[PDB]
Amino acid sequence: PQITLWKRPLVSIKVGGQIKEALLDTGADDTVIEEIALPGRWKPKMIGGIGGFIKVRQYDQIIIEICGKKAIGTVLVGPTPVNIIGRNMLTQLGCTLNF
Amino acid sequence: PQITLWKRPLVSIKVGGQIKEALLDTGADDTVIEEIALPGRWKPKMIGGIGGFIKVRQYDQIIIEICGKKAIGTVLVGPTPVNIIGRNMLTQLGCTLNF
Ligand SMILES: Cc1c(O)cccc1C(=O)N[C@@H](CSc1ccccc1)[C@H](O)CN1C[C@H]2CCCC[C@H]2C[C@H]1C(=O)NC(C)(C)C
């Protein structure tokens, strides 16, 4: 489909067995989610937002349902205000910006 | 045009009589540019995100240009690591998200 930007592009997602609200974010390289339990070993990571950097746990090959679709990739977990679907996941969905 | 997200969706914009590079951000409610001279009076504003909050100057009635298309609205000026074109401007350009 086509999503307009008159309001925040919020969608429902399923990650780590839970349903959540997330933001389709072309301004994010990564997909980051509030504290949640994911399987496997993680790696440390720094991501720089508008107010500076923070540390998050990096899990790889994590499954996520988004827009009746599935994306399997890197998911960062940390103290984020909003759950974010970054470009690494958006590209798996075949998202493009059009204007 | 149609922009893919394999890499950051950076584009050239014409703002404040200046040509700058900025990121088309569907996750940003607002548009914020690094230090730049703009006409009119401003009001202080705090915007937050990953990493915390920063202080910015809010200018209204600012015109910007991206790929031959123009839009007018509010532009925030402050210490941002990357220039962000938010939804307040993306809508005016007829920018949508497709998949
Ligand atoms: C989450 C993330 C990554 O994993 C990797 C790179 C950047 C980001 C990141 O924070 N990107 C942001 C743009 S600010 C930005 C900073 C550096 C580079 C590019 C953009 C988000 O797209 C938008 N971001 C989405 C969201 C992040 C959690 C807090 C609530 C909003 C805040 C909003 C935001 O920051 N809005 C402003 C108006 C202050 C610009």
Structure report:
- Two copies of one chain form a homodimer.
- The first copy, chain A, has 99 residues and is mostly beta strands.
- Chain A has a single domain, classed as Acid Proteases (Cathepsin D, subunit A, domain 1), CATH 2.40.70.10.
- Helices cover 6% and strands 55% of the residues of chain A.
- The longest helix of chain A is centred in the last third of the chain and has 6 residues, at 87-92.
- The radius of gyration of chain A is 13 Å and the shape is globular.
- Bound molecules: ligand 1UN.
- The ligand Cc1c(O)cccc1C(=O)N[C@@H](CSc1ccccc1)[C@H](O)CN1C[C@H]2CCCC[C@H]2C[C@H]1C(=O)NC(C)(C)C sits between chains A (25, 27-30, 32, 47-50, 80-82, 84, 86) and B (23, 25, 27-30, 32, 47, 49-50, 81-82, 84, 86).
- It is classed as hydrolase.
Draw up the topology in text:
The structure is a homodimer of 99-residue chains.
Chain A (H helix, E strand, L loop, with lengths): L1 E2 L6 E6 L2 E7 L7 E2 L9 E7 L2 E15 L2 E9 L5 E3 L1 H6 L3 E3 L1
Parallel strand pairs in A: 3-8, 4-7
Antiparallel strand pairs in A: 2-3, 2-6, 5-6, 6-7
Main location (chains A, B): host cell
Subcellular location (chains A, B): Host endosome, Host multivesicular body; Virion membrane
GO molecular function, one term (chains A, B): aspartic-type endopeptidase activity
How many domain units of chain A? 1
- Second-tier CATH architecture of chain A: Beta Barrel
Could you describe the largest sheet of chain A, including whether it forms a barrel?
7 strands, mixed
Q: Could you name the CATH homologous superfamily of chain A?
A: Acid Proteases
Radius of gyration of chain A: 13 Å
The secondary-structure element order of chain A is: EEEEEEEEHE
The CATH topology assignment of chain A is: Cathepsin D, subunit A, domain 1
Bound molecules: ligand 1UN
Which percent range describes the beta-strand content of chain A? Answer: over 45%
**What global shape of chain A is seen?**
globular
Q: How many β-strand stretches of chain A? A: 9
Span from first to last CA of chain A? Answer: 15 Å
Helix content of chain A: under 10%
Structural class of the helix and strand makeup of chain A? Answer: mainly beta
The CATH C-level name of chain A is Mainly Beta
PDB class: hydrolase
Keywords: HIV-1 subtype C, Aspartyl protease, Hydrolase, Protease, viral protein
Assembly: dimeric
Entry title: Crystal Structure Analysis of HIV-1 Subtype C Protease Complexed with Nelfinavir
